[PDB]
Paper text:
All these phenolamide synthesis enzymes belong to the acyl-coenzyme A (CoA)-dependent BAHD acyltransferases family, which was named according to the first letter of each of its first four biochemically characterized enzymes: Benzylalcohol O-acetyltransferase, Anthocyanin O-HCT, HCT of anthranilate, and Deacetylvindoline 4-O-acetyltransferase. It has been established that BAHD acyltransferases catalyze the transfer of acyl groups from acyl-donors (Acyl-CoA) to various acyl-acceptors. In this study, we first performed structural analyses on two representative BAHD family enzymes, the Arabidopsis mono-/di-acyltransferase-SDT (AtSDT) and poly acyltransferase-SHT (AtSHT), then explored the acceptor-molecule specificity and potential molecular mechanisms of multisite acylation by structure-based mutagenesis approaches, and, finally, successfully predicted and varified the acyl acceptor substrates of two uncharacterized BAHD family transferases in Arabidopsis using our prediction methods on the basis of a sequence similarity network (SSN) and of structure modeling.
In addition, the multisite acylation mechanisms of BAHD-family acyltransferases also remain poorly understood until now.
Residue numbers in the entry: 3 to 367, 378 to 409, 415 to 451
The structure:
C-alpha cells in the first residue's frame, strides 16, 4: 500500500571518466537484468536527527564517483555483444511513503506484493534509457524504513553489487572506502584476445551444451508457461549435520574433506526435485551452480574487481540415477563440477564464449527437468548502516537460492521456485527423505 512516490535522477558528484567501456564475456552472458535486494530498518532512535532521504541521495552521488560505470548506459554491438557507455547519465532514486506498518508484514522473505517497495524496470524500453542502478527508500507509517536496491547483472555479479552497496553505507557514515574498486576489465580480457593457449583446449564443458528438454517434447515452451511458486524452507543446524554425515558416509565423498553445506544441500535438492517431478528414469537433468572465479584464476582477480566474475557451471545426470543412488552420489556430482573450475577451465570457458557467433542464446532469465541452485551463503549482505542503525532484515527477491539464516548461525533457508504441481511432493521429500 503506497501513498506517495517521487523519482529523481542521481549523477556522480564530480566529473568522471567518460567514454566507451568494453565488457568481459561473463558480463554479456547469463543474467543481464537487475539483482534486487531489500533492507528493512526499525524507526531510527531519537538520537538521529539527520535527513534519511537526503543522506541517501548525497552519499549515492558521492559513491558514484568511485563506481562511475554504474551511472552509464548499455549499447548493443554486433553479434549479441554489448558494451558500456560511461556517460554519467545517472541512476534512478525513488522516495516513497506507505500507510502500512512494519508490523503488517507477515514475515520477511523474498515474497511478492513487495513490488510497491522495488523500483520496477521496463526491459522493452530502448537500452540507453534503462538505468543500471535503481533504489527506492520507503517510509512506513510508524517510522520503519525499507530500502530496495536493484543493480544490473549485465555490469556486476552479486559480489560486486554488494560491494557497491556496502561502500554506499560507509560513505553515508562519512568514513573512507573499505576496498577501492578495480574498474579496468582488461584484466579479464574485455574486448581483447586471450593469451595463446600452451596446449590446445578441449571444449567439453557441460555448460556449453543446451539444457535437455523433457523426453517427450522438442522445445520447452509448455514447461516455461506453467504456474510456479516460491516457498521458504528452513534447514536447522542439526538437519544439516544429518544430511552432511549421511553424504560423507558415501564412498563418493572426499576423505579428509567432507562435503560442504552447499554441496550437500544442492545434492539433496536435486534428488528431491527429481523425486517430485515423476520423470522417466532416463530423463536427462542438469543443475546450474554459480561459481565466483575471482580467487579461482591464477593470477587471481584484483581485490575489489568490479564486474561479472561469476560463471554458471553445469552438473548433469539422469533422474533415475539421482533418485536411485544414495545422497553422496548427487553431492559428488556437484562437488566434482566445482573442483573442475581451475584457471585453465575458466580460460577455456572465456575462449568458448569469445568464439561464439551470437551471445543472445546465452542471455535472459532453466526449469523442469533442469535446476539451478545459487549460493548466497558468503555474500557480504549484513550490517548496512547509513546510519540510523543496521537493518533488522535483508534479503534478495528454475533457480533456488541458499540463504544463510540471519538468526541462527550455521542454519540456512532454501528459497525454492518450483511448479505448483510438484511443490508439495518436493517439501515432503525435502524434510522426510533426509
Ligand atoms: C561454488 C561455491 C558455491 C561452492 O561453495 P562451497 O561448496 O561452500 O565451497 P567453498 O570452497 O567455497 O567453501 C568451503 C567452506 O569454507 C568456507 N569458505 C571457503 N572459501 C571461502 C571464501 N573464499 N570466502 C568465504 N568463505 C569461504 C565456505 O563458507 C564453506 O563453508 P561451509 O561448508 O561451512 O558452508 C562457492 O565457492 C562460490 O563460488 N560461491 C559463489 C556464490 C555467488 O557468488 N553467488 C551469487 C552470484 S550473482
Amino acid at each position: 500500500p503506497i501513498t506517495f512516490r517521487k523519482s529523481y535522477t542521481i549523477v556522480p558528484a564530480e566529473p568522471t571518466w567518460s567514454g566507451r567501456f568494453p565488457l568481459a564475456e561473463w558480463d554479456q552472458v547469463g543474467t543481464i537484468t537487475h539483482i534486487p535486494t531489500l533492507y528493512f530498518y526499525d524507526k531510527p532512535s531519537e538520537s538521529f536527527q539527520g535527513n534519511v532521504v537526503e543522506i541517501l541521495k548525497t552519499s549515492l552521488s558521492r559513491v558514484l564517483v568511485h563506481f562511475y560505470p554504474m551511472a552509464g548506459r548499455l549499447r548493443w554491438l554486433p553479434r549479441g555483444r554489448f558494451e558500456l557507455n560511461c556517460n554519467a547519465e545517472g541512476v534512478e532514486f525513488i522516495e516513497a511513503e506507505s500507510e502500512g506498518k512494519l508490523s503488517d508484514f507477515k514475515d520477511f522473505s523474498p515474497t511478492p506484493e513487495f513490488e510497491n517497495l522495488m523500483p520496477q524496470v521496463n526491459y522493452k524500453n530502448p537500452i540507453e534509457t534503462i538505468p543500471l542502478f535503481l533504489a527506492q527508500v520507503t517510509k512506513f507509517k510508524c517510522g520503519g524504513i525499507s530500502l530496495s536496491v536493484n543493480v544490473s547483472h549485465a555490469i556486476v555479479d552479486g559480489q560486486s553489487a554488494l560491494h557497491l552497496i556496502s561502500e554506499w553505507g560507509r560513505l553515508a557514515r562519512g568514513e573512507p572506502l573499505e576496498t577501492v574498486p578495480f574498474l579496468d576489465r582488461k584484466i579479464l580480457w574485455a574486448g581483447e584476445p586471450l593469451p595463446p593457449f600452451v596446449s590446445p583446449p578441449k571444449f567439453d564443458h557441460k555448460e556449453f551444451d543446451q539444457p535437455p528438454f523433457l523426453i517427450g517434447e522438442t522445445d520447452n515452451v509448455e514447461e516455461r508457461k506453467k504456474k510456479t511458486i516460491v516457498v521458504m524452507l528452513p534447514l536447522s543446524t542439526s538437519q544439516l549435520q544429518k544430511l552432511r554425515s549421511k553424504a560423507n558416509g558415501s564412498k563418493h565423498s572426499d576423505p579428509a574433506k567432507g562435503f560442504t553445506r552447499y554441496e550437500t544441500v544442492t545434492g539433496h535438492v536435486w534428488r528431491c526435485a527429481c523425486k517430485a517431478r515423476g520423470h522417466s528414469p532416463e530423463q536427462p537433468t542438469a543443475l546450474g551452480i554459480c561459481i565466483d572465479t575471482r580467487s579461482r584464476m591464477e593470477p587471481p582477480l584484483p581485490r575489489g574487481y568490479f564486474g561479472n566474475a561469476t560463471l554458471d557451471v553445469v552438473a548433469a545426470s539422469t533422474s533415475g540415477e539421482l533418485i536411485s543412488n544414495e545422497l553422496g552420489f548427487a553431492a559428488s556430482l556437484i562437488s566434482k563440477a566445482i573442483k573442475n573450475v581451475t584457471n585453465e577451465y575458466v580460460m577455456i570457458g572465456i575462449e568458448y564464449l569469445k568464439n561464439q557467433k551470437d551471445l543472445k542464446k546465452f542471455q535472459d532469465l532453466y526449469g523442469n527437468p533442469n535446476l539451478g541452485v545459487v549460493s548466497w551463503l558468503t555474500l557480504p549482505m549484513y550490517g548496512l548502516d547509513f546510519g540510523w542503525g543496521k537493518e533488522f532484515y535483508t534479503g534478495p527477491g528454475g533457480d533456488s537460492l541458499i540463504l544463510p539464516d540471519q538468526n541462527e548461525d550455521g542454519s540456512v533457508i532454501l528459497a525454492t521456485c518450483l511448479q505448483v504441481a510438484h511443490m508439495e511432493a518436493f517439501k515432503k521429500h525435502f524434510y522426510e527423505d533426509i
